[PDB]
Motif scaffolding. Structure first.
Motif, PDB file in Angstrom:
ATOM      1  N   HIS A 182       0.568  -1.132   0.340  1.00  0.00           N
ATOM      2  CA  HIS A 182      -0.247  -0.320  -0.019  1.00  0.00           C
ATOM      3  C   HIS A 182       0.902   0.925  -0.174  1.00  0.00           C
ATOM      4  N   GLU A 184       0.209   5.540   1.764  1.00  0.00           N
ATOM      5  CA  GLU A 184      -0.415   5.848   2.627  1.00  0.00           C
ATOM      6  C   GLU A 184      -2.117   6.758   1.783  1.00  0.00           C
ATOM      7  N   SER A 190       4.073   8.209   6.036  1.00  0.00           N
ATOM      8  CA  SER A 190       3.520   7.370   7.624  1.00  0.00           C
ATOM      9  C   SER A 190       5.011   7.856   8.293  1.00  0.00           C
ATOM     10  N   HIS A 270       4.802   0.075   0.026  1.00  0.00           N
ATOM     11  CA  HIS A 270       5.178  -0.858   0.911  1.00  0.00           C
ATOM     12  C   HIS A 270       4.915  -1.565   1.635  1.00  0.00           C
TER      13      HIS A 270
HETATM   14 NI    NI Z   1       1.978   2.164   6.249  1.00  0.00          NI
END
Ligand code: NI
Ligand code: OGA
Ligand code: MG
Ligand code: ZN
Length: 331
Positions: A182, A184, A190, A270
């Motif tokens: 995914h 963010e 993040s 990630h």
């Molecule tokens: Ni994440």
């Protein structure tokens, strides 16, 4: 151009450099860290998040999630089956039980091999997405509950005042608990602090190459792709490093240990897994450089991704053409 190969960079700020969070993010970007999609930050030796973790057992995990896989060992999805509530002390005991505990292993590479070989044959239980913080209120540096808010950043950069709030989340993990590929929400940054316990291994695709991952994912998950033009927003798909290498997708990997921060950068895909019982804290944040990524972020409108209250304003202001369709997906 700094960091042209998009390697994951590791930083060791001094206690003085640890004072000003925004300034240090900008420093890391001056050295090309964002090109990787992920950086590690080792806090100065003088710093601590809190005094001890001896009194966390009574935190409640209201909705532990059993992560059930489908597919093949290197290309699978997971769904989250809700389980009955349990305390952190009860979850720790569960993680350490014979059914769920980390197997014997030689080193992180052996464990990584075992993860990719065997993950699909087990269904680990993840305490994810728990609103709260383990930073002491007196920790003034890199306290993930005291960061500048994304609403304030949008207001500072663009002049528009918006509703919404920005608070951290706790994650209690066990062996084989998994975070799917995914970016963010709204392609935000993040930051993730591993408070205690066993490591977390990360995989990341450079932001400049994220569309290569998306194209592979549409090939590998063809029904999901027909269902939704941004199905990685569902946060259910896993692709192994071996499969990424076979398909020529640029990526890097790193293992985070307790006491270390990781930052993910806008549009850095990630994924990863936990080595054993652990606890992490994470929150989204923005900088000026994020705004352009927020304006271009994909969105899921099929109904699956369902997100926080505070994403409404980000869509409404940054993506007004998309707003009506996205909000229908929310309702
Ligand atoms: Ni994440
Ligand atoms: O630790 C996890 O399960 C997942 N965390 C993240 O995706 C992050 O911090 O951005
Ligand atoms: Mg407690
Ligand atoms: Zn969708």
């Amino acid at each position: 151009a700094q960091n042209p190969n998009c390697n994951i960079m590791i930083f060791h700020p001094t206690k003085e450099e640890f004072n000003d969070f925004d300034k240090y993010i900008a420093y890391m970007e001056s050295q090309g860290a964002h090109r990787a999609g992920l950086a590690k930050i080792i806090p100065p030796k003088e710093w601590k998040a809190r005094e001890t973790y001896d009194n966390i057992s009574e935190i409640l995990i209201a909705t532990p999630l059993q992560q059930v896989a489908s597919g093949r060992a290197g290309v699978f999805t997971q769904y989250h089956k809700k389980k009955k509530a349990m305390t952190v002390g009860e979850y720790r005991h569960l993680a350490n039980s014979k059914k769920y505990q980390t197997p014997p292993h030689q080193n992180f590479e052996d464990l990584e091999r075992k993860y990719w070989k065997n993950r699909i044959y087990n269904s680990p239980i993840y305490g994810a997405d728990i609103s709260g913080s383990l930073f002491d209120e007196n920790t003034k540096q890199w306290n993930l509950g005291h960061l500048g808010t994304i609403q304030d950043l949008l207001e500072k950069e663009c002049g528009v005042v918006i509703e919404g709030v920005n608070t951290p989340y706790l994650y209690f993990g066990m062996w084989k608990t998994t975070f799917a590929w995914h970016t963010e929400d709204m392609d935000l940054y993040s930051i993730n602090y591993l408070h205690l316990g066993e490591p977390k291994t990360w995989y990341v695709v450079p932001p400049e190459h994220g569309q290569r991952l998306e194209r592979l994912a549409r090939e590998l998950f063809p029904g999901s792709s027909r269902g939704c033009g941004a199905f990685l927003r569902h946060k259910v798909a896993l692709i192994s490093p071996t499969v990424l290498k076979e398909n020529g997708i640029p990526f890097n990997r790193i293992t985070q240990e307790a006491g270390e921060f990781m930052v993910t950068f806008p549009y850095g895909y990630h994924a990863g897994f936990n080595h054993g019982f652990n606890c992490a804290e994470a929150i989204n944040f923005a900088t000026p450089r994020w705004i352009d990524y927020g304006k271009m972020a994909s969105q899921c409108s099929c109904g699956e991704a369902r997100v926080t209250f505070s994403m409404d304003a980000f869509v409404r202001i940054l993506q007004p053409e998309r707003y009506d369709l996205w909000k229908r997906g929310q309702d």
